[PDB]
Amino acid sequence: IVGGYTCGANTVPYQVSLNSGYHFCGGSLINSQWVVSAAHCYKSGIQVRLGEDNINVVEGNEQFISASKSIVHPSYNSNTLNNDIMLIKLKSAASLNSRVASISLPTSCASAGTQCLISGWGNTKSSGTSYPDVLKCLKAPILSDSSCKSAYPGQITSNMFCAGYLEGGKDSCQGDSGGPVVCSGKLQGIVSWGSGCAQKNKPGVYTKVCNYVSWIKQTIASN
Ligand SMILES: COc1ccc2c(CCN)c[nH]c2c1
Ligand SMILES: [Ca+2]
After folding, report:
1. How far apart are CA 164 and CA 169, in angstroms?
2. Please, which residues have CB within 8 angstroms of residue 81's CB and are 6 or more apart in sequence?
3. DSSP codes joined into one string, 124-146
4. Which residues, listed in sequence order, are joined to residue 208 by a DSSP beta bridge?
5. How far is the CA of 60 from the centre of ligand 1 (A)?
6. What is the rounded distance in angstroms from the CA atom of residue 170 to the CA atom of residue 86?
7. Cβ distance 211 to 84 under 8 Å?
8. How far is residue 216's CA from residue 219's CA, in Å, rounded to a whole number?
9. Structural domains for the chain
């Protein structure tokens, strides 16, 4: 997260870290057994880390649970990033508590102008690299689809939305991939792609979760 702030330990209790020997992506806990992340975060050997603040220190509220199954969206296209969503099932159910909590799926699609919370352990610099230990947060509004398409002509599908700032300086970045965009207490977006981080006229692009609620619900009812 570039241009954000330190969330505060466990104040984003649905935020997970995906670990393959090191943190490589975020995700969102949607119930005791399932995490939503980006399809571009798919890899083998995923351990889901819940209850994290400092990802380099065991602080006492973590749960580390291996993935037992990953399900990338059937229509995910890695070249265009259309349908950039994946489900991860936990080998055992997480114990839900004040530091480990699920986030509800949306009932409707959030509207332009709505303020949302984006979080992760990604790079905090728009030029160069610096990776934080504690979870970072950014408040960012959803942008109109006309402004989103103007920023990324020919690239925004109906499964994507832009959030952030056209002036740059505040954005999600490398390593925030797969993490949550939460608006009105619901998971509306997944950190998906952009042109760099926090660049002028290049706001972050996010998977439009509301389009996937039926797929999520049917998949978790059968796996
Ligand atoms: C390889 O560099 C990057 C830089 C930024 C991003 C993002 C978020 C952009 N708002 C998702 N994946 C990335 C990969
Ligand atoms: Ca920790």
Report:
1. 9
2. 40, 160, 192, 193, 205
3. --SSS----SS-EEEEEEBPPHH
4. 189
5. 30
6. 26
7. no
8. 5
9. 5-7+103-211 (2.40.10.10), 15-102+212-221 (2.40.10.10)
What is the DSSP track for 85-99?
Answer: -EEEEESS-----SS
Q: Is the CB of 135 under 6 A from ligand 1?
A: no
Q: What kind of experiment solved this structure?
A: X-ray
Resolution (A): 1.2
User: Among all chains, which residue has been given the structure tokens 């806990």?
Assistant: 29
Q: In this structure, which residue's CA is closest to atom 14 in ligand 1? A: 174
Task: Ligand 1, residue 198: give the atom nearest the CA.
Answer: 10
Paired strand residues for 90: 67
Task: Reply yes or no on whether 150 is catalytic.
Answer: no
Cα-based distances in Å from 198 to 202, 205, 211: 7, 12, 26
Q: How far is the CA of 62 from the centre of ligand 2 (A)?
A: 6
53 assigned to active site: no
CA distances from 95 to 68, 91, 184 (A): 17, 13, 24
Q: Which residues pair with 70 in a beta bridge?
A: 88
Cβ of 174 less than 6 Å from ligand 1: yes
